[PDB]
Amino acid sequence: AQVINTFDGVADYLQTYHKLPDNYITKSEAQALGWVASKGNLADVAPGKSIGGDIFSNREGKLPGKSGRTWREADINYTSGFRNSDRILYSSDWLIYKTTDHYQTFTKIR
């Protein structure tokens, strides 16, 4: 049912509808469906789904912090198997960043 999982498609969607596309599910949900990260079976138990929506704690402080602002993250370019190193980062006030080097560096895209 047409998956939206590219940096721009998701960013546009987050800004236009203020929520992730329907092909996203949190880690807890994925697990509730039988997902086991070490098995890399996300596609097996949840076809067409990608992990996304969990709170992002911005532990290195690389993303701009602000009282009342909470960050969340979602997997980008994921299809099946083990998770890649791509993520989209979005704030409660809708700032959008991305990383392709596993949270090493980020780039503001919105």
Partner: protein, 89 residues
């Protein structure tokens, strides 16, 4: 499954992340940072997990607050639901 850290051998924040990369079989792309560690502990690593951190204090020295910040992520992952056992010796 089982991960060991020999504190006295940690000379930098780098040695630590790389020791973790090997001990936890993290992805080659591992970001070697707190966020990458969290994501690995909750979306990659295999459970149950037992982390045995020896000579923590010594490793705390040559890494600043790094060791403590790394330890924190493990502790929150556990509080998050991850089946992690931490042995600080």
């Amino acid at each position: 499954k089982k991960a060991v850290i020999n504190g006295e051998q940690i000379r930098s924040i780098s040695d630590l992340h790389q020791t973790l990369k090997k001990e936890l079989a993290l992805p080659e792309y591992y970001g070697e940072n707190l966020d990458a560690l969290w994501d690995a502990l909750t979306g990659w690593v295999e459970y149950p997990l037992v982390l045995e951190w020896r000579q923590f204090e010594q490793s705390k020295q040559l890494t600043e607050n790094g060791a403590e910040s790394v330890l924190q992520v493990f502790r929150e992952a556990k509080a998050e639901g991850a089946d992690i056992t931490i042995i600080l010796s």
